[PDB]
Amino acid sequence: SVEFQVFCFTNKIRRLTLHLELHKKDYSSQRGLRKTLGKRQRLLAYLLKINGVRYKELISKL
Amino acid sequence: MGKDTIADIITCIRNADMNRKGTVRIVSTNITENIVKILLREGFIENARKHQERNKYFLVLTLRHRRNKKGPYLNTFHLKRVSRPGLRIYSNYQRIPRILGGMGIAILSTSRGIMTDREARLEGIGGEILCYIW
Amino acid sequence: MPTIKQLIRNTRQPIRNVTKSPALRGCPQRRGTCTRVYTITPKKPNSALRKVARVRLTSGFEITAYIPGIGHNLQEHSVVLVRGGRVKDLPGVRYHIVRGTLDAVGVKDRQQGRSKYGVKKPK
Amino acid sequence: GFGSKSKKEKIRDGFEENVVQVRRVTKVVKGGKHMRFRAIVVVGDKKGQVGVGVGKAKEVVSAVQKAAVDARRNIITVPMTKYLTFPHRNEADYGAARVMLRPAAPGTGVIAGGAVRTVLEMAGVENALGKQLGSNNALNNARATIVAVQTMRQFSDVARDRGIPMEELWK
RNA sequence: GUUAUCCGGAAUGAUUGGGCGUAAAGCGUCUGUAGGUGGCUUUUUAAGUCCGCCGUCAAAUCCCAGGGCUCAACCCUGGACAGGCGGUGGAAACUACCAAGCUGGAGUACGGUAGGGGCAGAGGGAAUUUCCGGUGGAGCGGUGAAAUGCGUAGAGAUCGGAAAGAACACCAACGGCGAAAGCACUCUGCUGGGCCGACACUGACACUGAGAGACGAAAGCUAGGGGAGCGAAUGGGAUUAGAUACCCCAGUAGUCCUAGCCGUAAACGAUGGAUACUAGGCGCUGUGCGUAUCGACCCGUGCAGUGUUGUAGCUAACGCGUUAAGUAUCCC
Numbered sequence A: 001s002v003e004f005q006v007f008c009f010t011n012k013i014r015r016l017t018l019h020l021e022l023h024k025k026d027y028s029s030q031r032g033l034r035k036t037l038g039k040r041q042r043l044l045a046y047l048l049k050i051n052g053v054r055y056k057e058l059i060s061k062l
Numbered sequence B: 001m002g003k004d005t006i007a008d009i010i011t012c013i014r015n016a017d018m019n020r021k022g023t024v025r026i027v028s029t030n031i032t033e034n035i036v037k038i039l040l041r042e043g044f045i046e047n048a049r050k051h052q053e054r055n056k057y058f059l060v061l062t063l064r065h066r067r068n069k070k071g072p073y074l075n076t077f078h079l080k081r082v083s084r085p086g087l088r089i090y091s092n093y094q095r096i097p098r099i100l101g102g103m104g105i106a107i108l109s110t111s112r113g114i115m116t117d118r119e120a121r122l123e124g125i126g127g128e129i130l131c132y133i134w
Numbered sequence C: 001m002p003t004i005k006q007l008i009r010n011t012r013q014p015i016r017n018v019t020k021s022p023a024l025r026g027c028p029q030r031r032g033t034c035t036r037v038y039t040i041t042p043k044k045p046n047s048a049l050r051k052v053a054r055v056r057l058t059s060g061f062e063i064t065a066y067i068p069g070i071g072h073n074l075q076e077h078s079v080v081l082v083r084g085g086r087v088k089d090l091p092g093v094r095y096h097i098v099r100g101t102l103d104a105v106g107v108k109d110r111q112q113g114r115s116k117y118g119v120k121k122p123k
Numbered sequence D: 001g002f003g004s005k006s007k008k009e010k011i012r013d014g015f016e017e018n019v020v021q022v023r024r025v026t027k028v029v030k031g032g033k034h035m036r037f038r039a040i041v042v043v044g045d046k047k048g049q050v051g052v053g054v055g056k057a058k059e060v061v062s063a064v065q066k067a068a069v070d071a072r073r074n075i076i077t078v079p080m081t082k083y084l085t086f087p088h089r090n091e092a093d094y095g096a097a098r099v100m101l102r103p104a105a106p107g108t109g110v111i112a113g114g115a116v117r118t119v120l121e122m123a124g125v126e127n128a129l130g131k132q133l134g135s136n137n138a139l140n141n142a143r144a145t146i147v148a149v150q151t152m153r154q155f156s157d158v159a160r161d162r163g164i165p166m167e168e169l170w171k
Numbered sequence E: 001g002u003u004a005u006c007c008g009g010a011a012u013g014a015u016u017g018g019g020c021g022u023a024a025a026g027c028g029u030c031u032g033u034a035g036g037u038g039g040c041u042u043u044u045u046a047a048g049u050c051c052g053c054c055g056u057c058a059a060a061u062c063c064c065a066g067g068g069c070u071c072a073a074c075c076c077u078g079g080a081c082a083g084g085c086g087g088u089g090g091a092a093a094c095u096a097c098c099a100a101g102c103u104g105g106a107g108u109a110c111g112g113u114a115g116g117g118g119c120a121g122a123g124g125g126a127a128u129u130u131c132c133g134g135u136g137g138a139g140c141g142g143u144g145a146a147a148u149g150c151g152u153a154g155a156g157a158u159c160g161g162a163a164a165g166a167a168c169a170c171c172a173a174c175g176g177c178g179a180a181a182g183c184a185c186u187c188u189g190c191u192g193g194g195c196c197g198a199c200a201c202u203g204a205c206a207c208u209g210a211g212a213g214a215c216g217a218a219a220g221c222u223a224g225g226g227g228a229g230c231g232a233a234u235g236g237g238a239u240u241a242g243a244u245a246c247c248c249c250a251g252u253a254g255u256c257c258u259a260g261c262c263g264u265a266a267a268c269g270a271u272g273g274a275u276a277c278u279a280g281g282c283g284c285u286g287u288g289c290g291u292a293u294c295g296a297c298c299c300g301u302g303c304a305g306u307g308u309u310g311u312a313g314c315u316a317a318c319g320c321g322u323u324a325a326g327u328a329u330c331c332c
Helices: A003-020 A029-050 A053-061 B006-017 B030-040 B117-121 D060-071 D114-121 D139-150 D156-162
Strands: B024-027 B045-051 B058-063 B105-109 B128-133 C029-036 C050-057 C062-066 C079-084 C095-097 D016-028 D033-045 D049-051 D054-057 D097-103 D128-134
Touching (some): A003 A053, A029 A053, B006 B024, B006 B030, B006 B058, B006 B128, B030 B045, B030 B058, B105 B117, C050 C079, C062 C079, D016 D060, D016 D114, D033 D060, D033 D114, D033 D139, D054 D060, D097 D139, D114 D128, D114 D139
Antiparallel strands (some): B024 B058, B105 B128, C029 C079, C050 C062, C079 C095, D016 D033, D097 D128
């Protein structure tokens, strides 16, 4: 299941970001946010590598 | 399952018999099957057996020995790769080498199949030299 | 240095055979003008009074050149012909002076190996 | 203590001897600084039978012959099939001296560095060419050739080992 | 003969052909773009690859074979392998491509699980110093030995009362976690990461990473707090020929915190990362299965991580050795 990985990582970045911006100095979870961004980004380049229209739907969903 | 499936088998051969263990377990892809098919019939090894463990067909390969010595195999096997991934080598039917005069063989990928120097020198075809053993 | 991309950028290159004579810079031996004909000492293990002529060259450099042989005629403002070759004992002397050539006479009374010192045959 | 060692020296027509270097190696003591002689002797008949040996003693000649008695218990035979040359090329390092040996045409006298050439001109091979890659040493050099010509196989024993009956050989 | 220039030797710029623990050399560690390399099966095109044929790469040179100068040098006649590029006809194993599946690589979902992972908030008690009281009266403190200091204005010692900042004894282990730096008084909150199982899911989504970005002990600096101890500089005493020093007594910046900058360390495992394979013994940590009881044990084990001796192999040696400095592949 791929779109649950992208969507799940998106909610991960939402909850972790609204953690981090009202907190502002945790330099440990910064790596977690950046590993999630990079991991999701290699997924988006993967599904963009496979398809057009379907990845256009992944952009249009979020 | 690393980068190479041929340094897979080959490095399992060198690491197999440099510790004198006369038994190899490797994956059985098409080109591994072809190499052990053109390698059991050339007297280097003894037997190759396919089987399965979790329905994954593998090759166990029995190496040669001799009798109770300081080391039970006298002639060290000396396997070597040539056409590395990222540096492909290619030869005509001129460059194709007689390894040590012929005591080694150079298994290589013709358009026919994969041959040895005997079976690609008579053909006159040439191709990508996988590796030569001696 | 992999075959891929650390080396089809470049390995590096060695510089040259570095010139063992920075003057003479065309080719082998070059006309000189004597400026000083002083005498200096070698490093610590040796002990001598080696007699060098600091010489201006026609190239554009000025350089202290050694004077071989025993006798020497070389006064102030004479003309010599320097050649390459490092005298080890003297710091700074890089060059020799040819003997028997222009305005630098051959050595006095030498009968072993004369072509290095510019002395014609006796007998 | 019978005397003069005439019968006991074994006149050495069977093994001809040469040094290849005699370096004076020295140790210091409380009294001072005293030296012994390390000689390296390569023994061998021209039949194909050589071996190195080191020795050291305060005399020169006892170090040479002492290295010889160490050497003439250390012999391999040279696999040299053809008209006094080599079956195939070989390379084998020992320590930090690497030696590439290469067979030659019969119109080629042995060309190698002094230690390698010494153990081959005593080995009775006539047609080889061996470059030395690595050390300036003489002992590990020569002993590296000895290891580089132990591991060398003819065509008859490779034909015997592989099981292939016979072809692919001009002679 | 000397000199100069060039190549060799020189594997001393390394594709053939080197290295990076300690010899010169692994970025401090990590994320990731470009780019490089990449699992298995089946099918398609042939760009690479290979084979045939054809065109051309002037002549001279070099190579072979003849011939001519009395030979040679040199001249001449004929021939051609390489190898380059192009046209064209074939092959499909490998790289690439087209399409379709696959799961062990990688993830996710789920259930557990361990932790000084991080940050924030609360709370804690020894100890030290200072102050305030009661006592008592001559030294206390310090040293190799002394002295400066403090002390009759009552020191130190002892008991009580406050206040202050900073650090957190035993537990502490050749232990756990983090990418490294680092992280230990306890509790709470938010939150990272790891490990293990079932097929529960997708189907190669992988590795590395130029430039880039982040973090990055300590000392340092800007701004504001705070300041007990310790303590560069400084000052005094001592030792000393001399002492700007080691010793001692005071002692400022600093040490701590807020917000930044700085971006270096023996940032060390003196060892970049990743995958696959190659004896064992003795351990520790986390989980999983079976035995044993039915419950804690306890034995073997499946893995992951951490350590100590050690076979093979490598190494100049010392040593390293499944967490390689082994065998190979990739990337910087």
